[PDB]
Amino acid sequence: DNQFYSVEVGDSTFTVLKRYQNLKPIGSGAQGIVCAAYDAVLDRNVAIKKLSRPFQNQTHAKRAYRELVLMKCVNHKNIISLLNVFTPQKTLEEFQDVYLVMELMDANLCQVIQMELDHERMSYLLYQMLCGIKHLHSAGIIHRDLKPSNIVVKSDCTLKILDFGLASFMMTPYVVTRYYRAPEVILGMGYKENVDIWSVGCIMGEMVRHKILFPGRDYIDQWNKVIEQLGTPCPEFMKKLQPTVRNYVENRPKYAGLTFPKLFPDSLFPADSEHNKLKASQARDLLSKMLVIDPAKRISVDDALQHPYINVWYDPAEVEAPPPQLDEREHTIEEWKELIYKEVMN
Numbered sequence: 001d002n003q004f005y006s007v008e009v010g011d012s013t014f015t016v017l018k019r020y021q022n023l024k025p026i027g028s029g030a031q032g033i034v035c036a037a038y039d040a041v042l043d044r045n046v047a048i049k050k051l052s053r054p055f056q057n058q059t060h061a062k063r064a065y066r067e068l069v070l071m072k073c074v075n076h077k078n079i080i081s082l083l084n085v086f087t088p089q090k091t092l093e094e095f096q097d098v099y100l101v102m103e104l105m106d107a108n109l110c111q112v113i114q115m116e117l118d119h120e121r122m123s124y125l126l127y128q129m130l131c132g133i134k135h136l137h138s139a140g141i142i143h144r145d146l147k148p149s150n151i152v153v154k155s156d157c158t159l160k161i162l163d164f165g166l167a168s169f170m171m172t173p174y175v176v177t178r179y180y181r182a183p184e185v186i187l188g189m190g191y192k193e194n195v196d197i198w199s200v201g202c203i204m205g206e207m208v209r210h211k212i213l214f215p216g217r218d219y220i221d222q223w224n225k226v227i228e229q230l231g232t233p234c235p236e237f238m239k240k241l242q243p244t245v246r247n248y249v250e251n252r253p254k255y256a257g258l259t260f261p262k263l264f265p266d267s268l269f270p271a272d273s274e275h276n277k278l279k280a281s282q283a284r285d286l287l288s289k290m291l292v293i294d295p296a297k298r299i300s301v302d303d304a305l306q307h308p309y310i311n312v313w314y315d316p317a318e319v320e321a322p323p324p325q326l327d328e329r330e331h332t333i334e335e336w337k338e339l340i341y342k343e344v345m346n
């Protein structure tokens with residue numbers, strides 16, 4: 001008689017509204033377990049993510065409340081839009097789980113990275129990534145943690161971002177990915193909008209190379225791979241570092257740094273025709289303006305949107321959606337539960 005029913009996807013239990021049918025697992029998609037389903041009311045397929053007791057600790061709760069708030073705060077075709085938010089529980093007292101429903105896409109960006117892509121679809125994905133990031137920046141949201149696993153793609157090239165990024169101690173055997181974070185994040189520097197441009201460059205370079213550009217067990221190894229390939233930054237960059245990090249970075253073995261022709265040889269790009277020959281040099285040129293250690297010498301979102309490799313997709317109304325209440329501090333489990341429950345019920 002109630003509007004909910006229970007199914008077992010994996011070893012997880014999905015209690016969802018009776019409008020969603022034929023639940024099957026898909027991918028990881030951060031912060032829990034996600035399902036594909038058919039929505040009988042909308043006559044379309046959807047993705048449903050379960051947030052199991054998001055108020056169980058500060059890290060889970062601060063992020064969950066931040067997501068739930070910020071999603072009815074953005075409106076752009078390359079940023080996640082929720083079709084529905086619900087909890088099967090009736091009261092605050094019994095409140096346990098939150099379910100997020102969104103349009104069903106087809107694949108991670110990780111899977112697309114493994115593929116061998118043409119310039120037309122490559123640049124269109126980066127175009128959509130830059131538009132979504134521009135929208136977030138214009139809404140006063142600087143991500144700082146873009147990664148392929150949090151960007152979903154459709155078969156027709158459409159792309160959406162999922163997570164809104166950073167704002168700590170976890171208990172599970174689930175590890176965070178850090179390879180796409182900017183030197184500002186690795187070195188605790190204070191940042192600006194183009195901190196997300198470094199992440200786009202890491203993604204674009206991985207699409208070309210089919211290898212993580214800057215892998216490592218932690219920031220120690222990750223930093224070595226940055227300076228090994230890009231070289232030690234100029235004395236101006238390091239002047240802007242805090243004394244302690246300053247000493248560790250000044251004393252790291254100096255590296256000359258390879259040029260971008262040798263970092264991404266023409267072998268990695270299609271270049272059997274004249275069109276592909278030109279697009280390869282354009283693609284490599286943008287990479288060299290994005291994979292810059294010093295954020296003062298790093299290209300901005302707006303400048304990269306006007307890059308010849310990118311601007312072939314520009315259209316009058318395509319990022320023209322201005323933002324249509326704020327973060328909190330230290331709360332307890334009881335307080336985060338009530339805060340999250342209110343946002344769910346409105």
Ligand SMILES: COc1ccccc1Nc1cc2cnn(-c3cc(C(=O)NC4COC4)sc3C)c2cc1F
Nearest residue numbers: 026027028029034047049100104105106107108162
């Ligand atoms: C904050 O994140 C979320 C918030 C709310 C709800 C969900 C999410 N996350 C989430 C959303 C999507 C949207 N599409 N997919 C997806 C579908 C795949 C697939 O195999 N589809 C078959 C081919 O057509 C059936 S693969 C893949 C990555 C997702 C995976 C997700 F984890």
